[PDB]
Design a protein around this ligand. Structure first.
Ligand SMILES: [K+]
Ligand SMILES: [K+]
Ligand SMILES: [K+]
Ligand SMILES: [K+]
Ligand SMILES: [K+]
Ligand SMILES: [K+]
Ligand SMILES: [Mg+2]
Ligand SMILES: [Mg+2]
Ligand SMILES: [Mg+2]
Ligand SMILES: [Mg+2]
Lengths: 173, 203, 141, 107, 150, 52
RNA sequence: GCCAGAACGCGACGAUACUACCCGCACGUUGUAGACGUAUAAGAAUAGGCUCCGGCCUCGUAUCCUAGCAGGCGAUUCCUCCGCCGGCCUCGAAGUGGCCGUCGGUAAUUCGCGUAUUGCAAUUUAGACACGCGCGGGAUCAAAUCCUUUGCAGACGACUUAG
RNA sequence: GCAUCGGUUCUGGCGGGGGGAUAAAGGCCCAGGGAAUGUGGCUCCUCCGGGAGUGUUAUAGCCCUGGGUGUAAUACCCUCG
């Protein structure tokens, strides 16, 4: 519930030498619409010669997942900055929505590469339709046939306020 | 939460530092505590790391006179545990001194506190806190290697008291077997409707 | 060749396993996501035992000894409901010791002050017969 | 004949004053009530009376026992501790002593 | 929850812990109750509704006349002779010796029997109710008033 | 001598705004939307939404 | 192994005058970091266990005890539960438990008399250890220091000796 | 000490209204198209539990594209008591 995917459409301000300017559309992941629009101008400034003071926003809409109850495999392309230089990566995730996949990606990059939110560009998010499109071995073991496994050494849940138990707890639940 | 006259804690299998912080808070609240079997406490990590820690402690001493003021290094397992507790208490105040007066620590189980109920602090148990595959040591081994002299005396005494317990457990099993038989014979004797009223109430 | 092995035997997470949640509800596993999350739903007629369709974290669930046979992977709510009632999940859940413990706990919490007085008196009348029988068997040793 | 007790209050312990890390305010005290372990449970006891009874040396008007009266005002923290105000602030040697939580103002 | 016929637990005063029967609600938080006197020794008297827990057991009141309750509920029923009955205590014992019980007035003694006659009869028709009203209430260990049903 | 708060004291609210009683009585804060069967999105708003 | 020995760490033993000591009873002129059901003994494993051998284990969310003037006086009725004493065994880590006997008390069932007035709340003055005092019974008849002296000792105290 | 009020403030519960893809899903029904971590059948290897082929709903089911119930429900945001 931290992120949502938005559609943002923007335009250069019309002038007499060019009425009816072109329209550009981007897909932005953001926690709210105030930072969705700020993110839009950031990316457009890097591609076209437009600013916020010489343009305007046309439309903002929320894109919802079409089947948020079906398990899917996702692939993501991204570009990030390390302490010296920039690099490209491709990672994979398994969940039920595009928003869930992006949230897991941001946590994963912070843990394994110490990359902050401010140094990551998302290039493309694609749902992998065929089971033959899975590349990473940590996903392949999850799409194996006839999967099943037990849960050994499970610690029982005990109220914090209850100190001084009178029996030795078990771990076979 | 519950207020008791005294709580007796069986020290086997508890992590040293976590049990120390819980015990310290109980004493400052106004609860009396007794800890037994202090030689069976646990410390996380390999034994060699614990040994190096104590040696660094041993090297500290007053320069101009080693009989006053200096850190006095106690060797017994119960005194190692007592040091950890005293660090989490304002022991230089009158309130702190009174709190420490509510605690007793022992090696083994002396005769006052056998034939008594021993509790457990699940927030400090090793089998519930430590990830399987990591390493741990016992305070009893560390004390033996820094100059504690009574490891074998305690080991022999503990064997004797467990042998007495085996006889006690034998009697306790017989009593339960007879009580179960009495409840069966008396159940189908008299109670025509008390049985169903109690069953509806949940008893 | 003689082999004598004594070890553990756990219940496995699998398609068809029935879970029990924190608030006494039930659900059946239809799809495995990770080693920590599972997609499940329970289409039960009893409003106290039914749960919607969604993802459950395994840390907040317990594995019951009930497994629905031949439940297809990824089956929808209609197919699960048909298999749920054909197998008789509600009847099987009522015969377990977990259910009986829950029922007993509910009854004791619903006692009023007058009920508490009467349960004390009824227990004494049963206790009187217990002491007489216990004295007889113990005297005969 | 009548092998029972006579108890109509709930037990409590005096913990400390309201304080920061290095500053203390005696006008409010913190009390732990036995058996209550969350804010929802502590909401039951708001407004009740609290008694602190102790011994003295001499007799005044037929007794050697004294009382300070107070009431419970609001919860404290997330674990069921509550705040209380007394007619006089408590003596501060009683950090760890016991108090009585009545049921007088009912429902 | 305060309606006539309900069973109340007394929390303070001389009769703390006793289970009584409520008769009527008075003006400013005061209540009128009775034991009855022949079941637990509590006569007709007033209590304040704050110092009371109301249970979920109601007794029938088909026999009580509802006409004598009203003059018991009059303002000066319990006072207007107190200033003279209190001279007995000082006249001796604290000055002389040999204390003796204060006599009960004839009207208050008679009104007790008239009201309680039908009330006891209704109580006797519920099993264990008579013994329940005779005993007193107390807290054991593991009893949490914020969870108890009453 | 003492400021009193409307939105808590009803007498003060009626002193300053005589229309308050009518607003509450006719339930002007619960007016329903006009009737009418609504059309649907024109099948190309949806195509652009999932376009990329 | 060897040196010191906590002057607010501990054990065993000898003799103990002065009612200093022991037992019993009755009081409070008293003190205690804080009674109010101050009720609960297996050991061991946690990628395994318990058992009456039938089975059972997420969960102490348990078990025991719990009614009567702060708990009276009688009856009906029952053979349960509790306590003070005495006799035998037993207990050494800082010494404990069991068996038996006499005596005293006792709602598992069902009743009859009494309760008021503390006036509509005000700690429910109630436990356990210590200490003091006064009786009534037993048991007991001691040492240390100064002083004189020694030189295995020594600044003076202290120390090893003798009277 | 209680009851009825005034000022400030903390904290529970209940009844409605509005918006967006006039939420997205979802259950039931209608029509079309697909495949596999291939259901039932058929074939072969082991009787030692099973495994390997073949192929599109049968004695299980799943995924895409339109339509009806439908101004369905619910979540989230705003708002009158
Ligand atoms: K009576
Ligand atoms: K009686
Ligand atoms: K409010
Ligand atoms: K709507
Ligand atoms: K539909
Ligand atoms: K096949
Ligand atoms: Mg010494
Ligand atoms: Mg107000
Ligand atoms: Mg609609
Ligand atoms: Mg709608």
């Amino acid at each position: 519930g931290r992120l949502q995917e938005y559609q943002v459409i923007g335009r250069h301000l019309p002038t007499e030498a060019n009425p009816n300017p072109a329209l550009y559309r981007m897909r932005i992941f953001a926690p709210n619409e105030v930072v969705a629009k700020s993110r839009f101008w950031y990316f457009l400034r890097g591609l076209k010669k437009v600013k916020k003071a010489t343009g305007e926003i046309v439309s903002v809409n929320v894109i919802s997942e079409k089947h948020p109850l079906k398990v899917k495999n996702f692939g993501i392309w991204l570009r990030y900055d390390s302490r010296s230089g920039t690099h490209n990566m491709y990672k994979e995730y398994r969940e039920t929505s595009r928003v869930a996949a992006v949230e897991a990606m941001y946590a994963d990059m912070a843990a394994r590469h110490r990359a902050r939110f401010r140094s990551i560009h998302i290039l493309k998010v694609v749902e992998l339709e065929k089971t033959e499109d899975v590349k990473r071995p940590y996903i392949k073991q999850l799409v194996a046939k006839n999967l099943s496994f037990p849960l050994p050494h499970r610690v029982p849940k005990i109220s914090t306020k209850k100190i001084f138990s009178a029996k030795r707890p078990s771990t076979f639940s | 939460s519950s207020f008791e006259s005294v709580v007796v804690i069986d020290g086997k299998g508890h992590l040293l530092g976590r049990l120390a912080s819980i015990v310290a808070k109980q004493l400052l609240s106004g609860q009396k505590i007794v800890v037994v079997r202090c030689e069976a406490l646990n410390i996380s990590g390999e034994f060699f790391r614990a040994k190096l820690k104590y040696h660094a402690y041993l090297r500290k001493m007053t320069r101009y006179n080693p009989t006053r003021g200096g850190p006095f290094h106690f060797r017994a397992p119960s005194r190692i545990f007592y040091k950890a507790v005293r660090g989490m208490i304002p022991h230089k105040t009158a309130r702190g001194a009174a709190a420490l007066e509510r605690l007793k620590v022992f090696e083994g189980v002396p005769p006052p506190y056998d034939k008594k109920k021993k509790m457990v602090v699940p927030q400090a148990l090793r089998v519930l806190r430590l990830q399987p595959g990591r390493k741990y040591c016992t305070v009893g081994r560390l004390s033996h290697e820094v100059g504690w002299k009574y490891q074998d005396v305690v080991a022999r005494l503990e064997e004797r008291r467990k042998a007495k317990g085996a006889a006690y457990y034998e009697r306790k099993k017989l009593a339960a077997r007879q009580l179960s038989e009495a409840k069966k014979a008396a159940a189908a004797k008299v109670d025509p409707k008390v049985s169903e009223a109690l069953a509806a109430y949940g008893y | 060749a003689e082999i004598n092995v004594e070890a553990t035997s756990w219940r496995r997470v699998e398609v068809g396993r029935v879970l029990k949640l924190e608030n006494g509800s039930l659900a059946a596993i239809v799809e495995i996501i990770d080693h920590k999350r599972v997609l499940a739903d329970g289409p039960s007629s009893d409003p106290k035992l039914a749960t919607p369709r969604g993802i459950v974290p395994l840390s907040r669930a317990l594995l019951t000894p009930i497994v629905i046979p031949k439940l297809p992977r990824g089956a929808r709510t209609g197919a699960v409901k048909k298999a749920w009632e054909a197998y008789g999940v509600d009847a099987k859940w009522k015969e377990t010791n977990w259910a009986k413990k829950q029922l007993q706990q509910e009854r004791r919490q619903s006692l009023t002050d007058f009920d508490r007085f009467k349960v004390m008196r009824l227990k004494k009348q049963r206790r009187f017969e217990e002491r007489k029988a216990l004295a007889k068997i113990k005297a005969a040793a | 004949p009548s092998e029972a007790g006579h108890r109509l209050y709930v037990k409590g312990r005096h913990l400390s004053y309201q304080r920061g890390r290095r500053n203390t305010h005696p006008k409010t005290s913190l009390i732990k009530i036995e058996g209550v372990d969350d804010t929802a449970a502590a909401n039951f006891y708001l407004g009740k009376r609290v008694a602190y009874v102790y011994r003295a040396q001499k007799e005044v008007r037929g007794t050697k026992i004294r009382v300070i009266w107070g009431k419970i005002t609001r919860p404290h923290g997330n674990s069921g501790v509550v705040r209380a105000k007394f007619t006089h602030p408590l003596p501060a040697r009683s950090f760890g002593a016991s108090v009585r939580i009545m049921l007088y103002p009912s429902s | 929850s305060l309606q006539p016929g309900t069973v109340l637990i007394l929390l303070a005063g001389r009769f703390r812990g006793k289970r009584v029967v409520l008769l009527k609600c008075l003006d400013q938080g005061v209540l009128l109750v009775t034991g009855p006197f022949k079941i637990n020794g509590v006569p007709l008297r007033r209590v304040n509704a704050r110092y009371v827990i109301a249970t979920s057991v109601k007794v029938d009141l088909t026999g009580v006349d509802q006409a004598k309750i009203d003059e018991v509920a009059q303002p000066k029923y319990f006072t207007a002779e107190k200033a003279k009955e209190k001279a007995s205590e000082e006249a001796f014992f604290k000055q002389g010796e040999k204390p003796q019980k204060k006599p009960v007035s004839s009207t208050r003694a008679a009104d007790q029997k008239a009201i309680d006659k039908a009330l006891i009869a209704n109580i006797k028709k519920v099993d264990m109710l008579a013994s329940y009203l005779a005993s007193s209430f107390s807290l054991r260990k593991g009893d949490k008033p914020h969870l108890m049903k009453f | 001598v003492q400021k009193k708060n409307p939105l808590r004291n009803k007498q003060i609210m009626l002193r300053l705004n005589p229309y308050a009683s009518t607003f509450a009585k006719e339930k002007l804060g619960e007016v329903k939307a006009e009737e009418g069967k609504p059309p649907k999105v024109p099948a190309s708003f949806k195509e652009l939404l999932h376009e990329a």
